Nucleic acid binder design. Structure first.
Ligand SMILES: Nc1ncnc2c1ncn2[C@@H]1O[C@H](COS(=O)(=O)NC(=O)[C@@H]2CCCN2)[C@@H](O)[C@H]1O
Ligand SMILES: Nc1ncnc2c1ncn2[C@@H]1O[C@H](COS(=O)(=O)NC(=O)[C@@H]2CCCN2)[C@@H](O)[C@H]1O
Ligand SMILES: [Zn+2]
Ligand SMILES: [Zn+2]
Lengths: 473, 473
RNA sequence: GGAGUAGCGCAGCCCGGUAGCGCACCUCGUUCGGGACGAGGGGGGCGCUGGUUCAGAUCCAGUCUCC
């Protein structure tokens, strides 16, 4: 057996590793997946980190309805125009046909708007810092596990502010949280930037995003944060009486990160041997594979369990593979496939000298005393993270490139990122895409100030800096 | 304040307190609610407790699809017959009409069955211990916030076993977890028992349950655990080859507890002054109300902020009410309404004095040295729990009655529980319900062994013990 | 033009006989330091609908699907 190497067919590698590592499986209904324990464990860790971050910045969780009245989706022009196509609709319910058909939420701005309309009255009711962990449906054509599924789990944040300034700071504060999650926890390097009009969220004034580069050279948006201005406030009549006794509109923001983030993790660190899970988000950090023969079994398994206690004490996430129906050889492969950062080999020769072998998913084995191991793993885990990150950063720089000639652009968007100048015209954008399939990823905040001429039509450059292009997922 | 007393109109008291305490609000769509932060905070605490308990008993979370193919619901006769009426159906999706209409999950046995069908192959593949935190829809007529909503959050556990024995032990293991949650965490006394055929879960062999008595004398089922036998295993072809070369059907179980549990909390401890939340589930256990005047606003708030830290240090869920725009007496009523177990009053004089006033939502009021507070609180939070539970016990004992005549029975089901004998015949049960509206709550596990004659038709008693009847929610 | 046959990957169809092989899975034993070995087993009725025939994955007709 094996696993299709990434160089042969990335897409297949992806689908297979997801299946073999038991992250998910295809669900009966079109475009859906079933998240099995190991995969969902990853999602829970992402929830915990984000939830903590969201709570430290004063947000509170709440839960709004799954069904949204079709009329609501219409109160906002741009919004309904961008989602109308991918909606799932409930028409029949309880035996009878519904008065007004209900839409399965694709996003919750509208329903929350409606409620905000009745909750916000004075300036004492602001800011409104809400978050919701849940599922959403979007009947999209062409789907991929995690990256794009009919139904998907995510977190959708919604805030309402008295001033445009406070709302914009919120929009950034969250995109920074998402970026912190990607860098400090997933070891995924990202580019914090701004989407161009053509690519922004339907109903938003502007959209900020984090863009990651997958090992196959394709870009992937892993999280978005939108400044909605007064679009929904106006659509749903969300006003309040400020301290100057003046009745004005609130400024709302929206932000979300779906389980697509799991896909980003897979396609950023995964290799031909399978998954490589970042330590800080991995369900199992250390897997202990006991090694023995009939006569060694008893004492070896006893040592292993002792080591399992010493490791749990250090607060590490450890798993002991007691399965007797498989050989060490076999187990080694399974756990490498599953992407566990460290495996500890405990054999009788090892137990003999009070030591053990520590194998790292990144490569290499080493012997250490059993007593040391507990206090040493945490630090090694951090180095593991540091390594994964510098490797990904390296991979990114090796695939980022400034282009001045359109012929150089075509070459660069085959390898990865293409830093080009653009006129800032939706018409040109569409053209470049129809021709190269590459799209606008974002206008990076930290990008160097530059002026030039559109890489394709020649007209004076826009944005005051090169834009990031790439073939994306 | 306009808080309808429970003695005047319980239902109104309920709806109002939910609204005024900001636990929830009505959603735009029929029969739905919007869980606001404070209410959802309660739900999160319930999740944390149950999840820890599920995890300690080897279960793992996963996530199955929201949409279920209509055909699946049909593979199990009884199941589709009991849910068919209350289904919401997606027919239109993505612009076109679906080949097969999709049902919004009312429960997940079927979809999981389908998946189990393809995952389970050998006994080494069992038991399957799965849990899923999510939402489900059930278009039911007559709804009440939390107790019965169109859409609702819950936890639904699904297990598959090799033997009937293991599956039945699982059924009880979970019902015990639910009961532990109700008693040790919600301070709600419950009766662990078995539903009669008429009242069991559609598709289950038998149904176990926890029944609580609300302050209005009505019974409420707060959690259920079902032994599904091979009903779904047979419907979805879920077999495996055992240690005896024999191929057989797995025995599955199902269990779930919805946010209805929040309603049980409200209607069990709530009073005319509002909510009374059990300490171990209360989002705020202590509220520090600083009292002052400009010339003292400095030291009081200083002391208050100090106490806030001291209490968080103890791991207590505290909240400081700074709000300079409200009188202390206003704040007192606000937090008595929201059910905070304790209130710490810090005034001007209390600085030089070194003491403070600790007031409990249960009538306690004492003066303690600010230094003693942090250490004393945890212990008081416990006595609080014990008291809450003690009262609910007394209430229950006072509204339970052994009846031997049908007349006495009609009397007893107006006050609460009626411990009567029954023939065990569905026809008779339906009769009693049509005449008194009371139903069968459960055949208690611990009930004393008794033989008699049906309270209504006179025929020999079934179950070998008295059945629990009551008007339920 | 090829192809739909066990969870996966395939052979069998010409020259009909009541379905087979690899991997997986069950049993037993031997194994166990980089995906073990042997023997014994369990599971499908061949995309679907006709027809010919004692008998149809196999022959005939037609319909659905993927490349
Ligand atoms: N079908 C899908 N499968 C998986 N992930 C998906 C899917 N659709 C959107 N996403 C991802 O979810 C995140 C949010 O999107 O669109 O951009 N955005 C919004 O929907 C705003 C912000 C949150 C509330 N509403 C994004 O980061 C986006 O990648
Ligand atoms: N509309 C509703 N609103 C609120 N709560 C509701 C609703 N419907 C059911 N419940 C409550 O949820 C719990 C599970 O309900 S049950 O008894 O039908 N059982 C089931 O649905 C099985 C067992 C768990 C997974 N599927 C029960 O304890 C039941 O009270
Ligand atoms: Zn241009
Ligand atoms: Zn009777």
């Amino acid at each position: 057996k094996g696993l299709t190497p990434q160089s042969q067919d990335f897409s297949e590698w992806y689908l297979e590793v997801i299946q073999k590592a038991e992250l998910a499986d295809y669900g009966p209904v079109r475009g859906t997946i079933v998240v099995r324990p190991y995969g969902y464990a990853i999602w829970e860790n992402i929830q915990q980190v984000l939830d903590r971050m969201f709570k430290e910045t004063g947000h509170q969780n709440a839960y709004f309805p799954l069904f949204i009245p079709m009329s609501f989706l219409r109160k906002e022009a741009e919004h309904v125009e961008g989602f109308s196509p991918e909606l799932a609709v409930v028409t029949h319910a309880g035996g009878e046909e519904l008065e007004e058909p209900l839409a399965v939420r694709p996003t919750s701005e509208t329903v929350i708007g409606y409620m905000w309309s009745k909750w916000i009255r004075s300036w004492r009711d602001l800011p409104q810092l809400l978050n919701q962990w849940g599922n959403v449906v979007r009947w999209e054509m062409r789907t991929r596990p995690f990256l794009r599924t009919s139904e998907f789990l995510w977190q959708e944040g919604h805030t309402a502010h008295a001033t445009r300034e406070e709302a914009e700071e919120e929009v950034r504060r969250m995109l920074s949280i998402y970026a912190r999650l990607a860098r400090e926890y997933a070891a995924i390097p990202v580019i914090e930037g701004l989407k161009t009009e053509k690519e922004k969220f339907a109903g938003a004034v502007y959209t900020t995003t984090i863009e990651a580069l997958m090992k196959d050279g394709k870009a992937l948006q892993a999280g978005t944060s939108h400044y909605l201005g007064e679009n929904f406030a106006r659509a749903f009549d969300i006003k309040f009486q400020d301290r100057d006794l003046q009745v004005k509109y609130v400024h709302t923001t929206s932000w979300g990160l779906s389980w697509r983030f799991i896909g980003a993790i897979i396609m950023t660190h995964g290799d031909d041997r399978g998954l490589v899970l970042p330590p800080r988000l991995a369900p199992i950090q250390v897997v202990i594979v006991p090694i023995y023969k009939d006569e060694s079994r008893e004492r070896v398994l006893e040592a292993a369990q002792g080591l399992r206690q010493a490791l749990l004490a250090q607060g590490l996430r450890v798993h002991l593979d007691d399965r007797d129906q498989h050989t060490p050889g076999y187990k080694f492969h399974e756990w490498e496939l599953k992407g566990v950062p460290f495996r500890v080999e405990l054999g009788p020769k090892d137990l003999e000298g009070g030591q053990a072998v520590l194998a790292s998913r990144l490569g290499g084995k080493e012997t250490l005393p059993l007593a040391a191991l507990p206090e040493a793993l945490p630090g090694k885990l951090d180095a593991f993270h540091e390594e994964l990150y510098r490797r990904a950063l390296a991979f990114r720089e090796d695939h980022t490139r400034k282009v001045d000639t359109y012929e150089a652009f075509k070459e660069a968007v085959q390898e990865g990122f293409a830093l080009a100048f653009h006129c800032g015209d939706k018409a040109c954008e569409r053209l470049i895409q129809e021709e190269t399939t590459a799209t606008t990823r974002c206008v990076p905040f930290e990008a160097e100030p530059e002026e030039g001429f559109c890489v394709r039509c020649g007209r004076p450059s826009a944005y005051g800096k090169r834009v990031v292009f790439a073939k994306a997922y």
